[PDB]
Amino acid sequence: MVNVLKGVLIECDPAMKQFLLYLDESNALGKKFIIQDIDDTHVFVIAELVNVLQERVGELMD
């Protein structure tokens, strides 16, 4: 089962903020690169480099 490995960052956001990150992913310019996938409602596989952006954008956004 050690078939495949992928370095990624695991984000453990709340059931409120996650969807926002989704929204950040789409309807965005130079984006949609951001989320690898939604593993759980709470957790997402995302970014790497994008994490700095996702966090900052969330901050700036309401």
Binding site: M1, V2, N3, K6, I10, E11, D39, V43
Partner: protein, 274 residues
């Protein structure tokens, strides 16, 4: 009179018994201090002997004058003993003892100037690795050594003392780290150095804990694992992450799991053997 040797003897016995491993000696040594002491002491085991050595000079503070001179006489013996002996605990003991002899003003500046012990304090002072505890006794020794010299007219030691200058790099480090304790020790060295030789030398805050919390926000740096060949290899590789305590998440119906970066390598090794 006959009682004196007996009573104090019992505490000599107690210190002797739990002499080796920890730091039992300090309290008992003090009691022992009051009641050729140095010559006789020398035979006894080093640790504890040093402890007694340390506190006795401190304890001195007419007949007292006689005592100081007597101590001065065998300052060499302790000094010979100090070197040669030279853990952090031991190291603390050697400088603490040296420091104490220094304040007494019994030690000969010459002799001290050319001795390994002075090199050793700045050596530990230089190295980043030494702990805060070693640092404070090392620092104190230096301060006391300089304190001892109330002249510098005739004090070769106030040359080697200059070895403080070497410390600045150490202070730069220490500063880089948030080690306030170390820095304070440095300042004491500087201030003391200047002192000896000065003549010769020319609500509202509620938003501030919230602004601190804005600098912390979570995610983890991570490996994901997928496309696992059969369930036994998820469960082995998963249980071997869970005992390593670096599972961030798991879902057995996905055959998918997550490890933070610090145990990527123990997983990469277990995936290769079994």
């Amino acid at each position: 009179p006959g009682v004196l040797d007996r009573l104090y003897g019992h505490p000599a016995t107690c210190l002797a018994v739990f002499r080796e491993l920890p730091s039992l000696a300090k309290n008992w040594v003090m009691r022992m201090l009051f009641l050729k002491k140095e010559f006789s002491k020398a035979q006894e085991e080093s640790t504890g002997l040093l402890s007694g050595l340390r506190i006795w000079h401190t304890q001195l503070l007419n007949l007292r004058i006689a005592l100081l001179g007597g101590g001065k006489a065998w300052s060499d013996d302790t000094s010979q003993l100090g070197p040669d002996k030279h853990v952090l605990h031991f190291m603390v003991g050697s400088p603490s003892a040296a420091v104490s002899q220094d304040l007494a003003q019994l030690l000969s500046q010459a002799g001290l100037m050319k001795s390994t012990e002075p090199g050793e304090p700045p050596c530990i002072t230089s190295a980043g690795f030494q702990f805060l505890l070693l640092d404070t006794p090392a620092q104190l020794w230096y301060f006391m050594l300089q304190y001892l010299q109330t002249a510098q007219s005739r004090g070769m030691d106030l040359v080697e003392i200059l070895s403080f200058l070497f410390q600045l790099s150490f202070s730069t480090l220490g500063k880089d780290y948030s080690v306030e304790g170390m820095s304070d020790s440095l300042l004491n060295f500087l201030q003391h150095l200047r002192e000896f030789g000065l003549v010769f030398q020319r609500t509202d805050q509620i938003r501030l804990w919230e602004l601190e919390r804005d600098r912390l926000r979570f995610t983890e740096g991570v490996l994901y694992n997928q496309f696992l060949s059969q369930v036994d290899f998820e469960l082995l590789l998963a249980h071997a992450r869970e005992l390593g305590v670096l599972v961030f998440e798991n879902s057995a119906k996905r055959l998918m799991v997550v490890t933070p970066a610090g145990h990527s390598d123990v997983k990469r090794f277990w995936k290769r053997q079994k």
